A paper describes a structure:
Analysis of this structure by SiteMap reveals the presence of a novel potential ligand binding site at the interface of the PHD and BRD domains ([Fig fig7]).
This crystallographic evidence validates the predictions made by SiteMap in the case of SP100C. Although the binding affinity of these compounds was not determined, they were clearly present in the crystal structure and surprisingly no fragments were found bound at the single-domain BRD or PHD pockets. It exploits hydrophobic interactions with surrounding residues. It also induces a conformational change in residue Q751 not observed for aniline **2**. This arrangement of these hits suggests that a fragment linking strategy could lead to optimized ligands ([Fig fig8]).
Numbering used by the authors: 701 to 877
Write the structure that this text describes.
C-alpha cells in the first residue's frame, strides 16, 4: 500500500485499503475510516464497485435529474466521494474551516459555508436530496467570489470550484456538451 495519505499526501497513522493500494488518515477518508474488522475497502473502491455493477450508470444524465435524486445510500456515497475529491486538492485548506469577514469595502455573506460544515451535514444525514449538498458546495465558492471581488485571491475560489464541478460531472456522469 501507499505510505502517504491519499487525500492530504502526508505520512502518519494510516489505514490501508484491502482492495487497492491507497492509504488514509482516519478523518481524511470520508466517511471516517470504519472500525470494523477485516477487510476494509476505501471509498474509491466502493464507488468503482457501484460503477461496475451497473455499467449503464456511466451513460449521460441531465444535471436537473441528478439534483432531484433522494439521498439513498448510493447517492450519499457519491456525495461523500465528491466532497473527498475536493479535499484532495491542497487549495481546499482555504475553504475547510469557518471563515470570517472583515475587509474594507466588503460585507460578509448572508449564509457562510465551509467544507467541514458540509462534511458534518453529510455525516449527520442532513441532506435529503443531492441538490442540498450541491447547493452548499457551490455556495462556498460563490460566497468567496462575491466577498473578495477584484482581489486576485478570488482566483482560489475559481480553482477549487473547477475541481468540484469536474468531479461532479464525472461522478454523476453528467451528459457531455
Ligand atoms: N472514465 C473512467 C470511469 N468512469 C466511470 C464511471 C462509471 C459510472 C458512473 C460514473 C463514472 N467508470 O470509469
Ligand atoms: Zn490525510
Ligand atoms: Zn481502495
Amino acid at each position: 500500500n501507499s505510505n502517504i495519505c491519499e487525500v492530504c499526501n502526508k505520512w502518519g497513522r494510516l489505514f490501508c485499503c484491502d482492495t487497492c493500494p491507497r492509504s488514509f488518515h482516519e478523518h481524511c477518508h470520508i466517511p471516517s475510516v470504519e472500525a470494523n474488522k477485516n477487510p476494509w475497502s476505501c471509498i474509491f473502491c466502493r464507488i468503482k464497485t457501484i460503477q461496475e455493477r451497473c455499467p449503464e450508470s456511466q451513460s449521460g444524465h441531465q444535471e436537473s435529474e441528478v439534483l432531484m435524486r433522494q439521498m439513498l445510500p448510493e447517492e450519499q456515497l457519491k456525495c461523500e466521494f465528491l466532497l473527498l475529491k475536493v479535499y484532495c486538492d491542497s487549495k481546499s485548506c482555504f475553504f475547510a474551516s469557518e471563515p470570517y469577514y472583515n475587509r474594507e469595502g466588503s460585507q460578509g455573506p448572508q449564509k457562510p459555508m465551509w467544507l467541514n460544515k458540509v462534511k458534518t451535514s453529510l455525516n449527520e444525514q442532513m441532506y435529503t436530496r443531492v441538490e442540498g449538498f450541491v447547493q452548499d458546495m457551490r455556495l462556498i465558492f460563490h460566497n468567496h467570489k462575491e466577498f473578495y471581488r477584484e482581489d486576485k485571491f478570488t482566483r482560489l475560489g475559481i480553482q477549487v470550484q473547477d475541481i468540484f464541478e469536474k468531479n461532479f460531472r464525472n461522478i454523476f456522469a453528467i451528459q457531455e456538451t
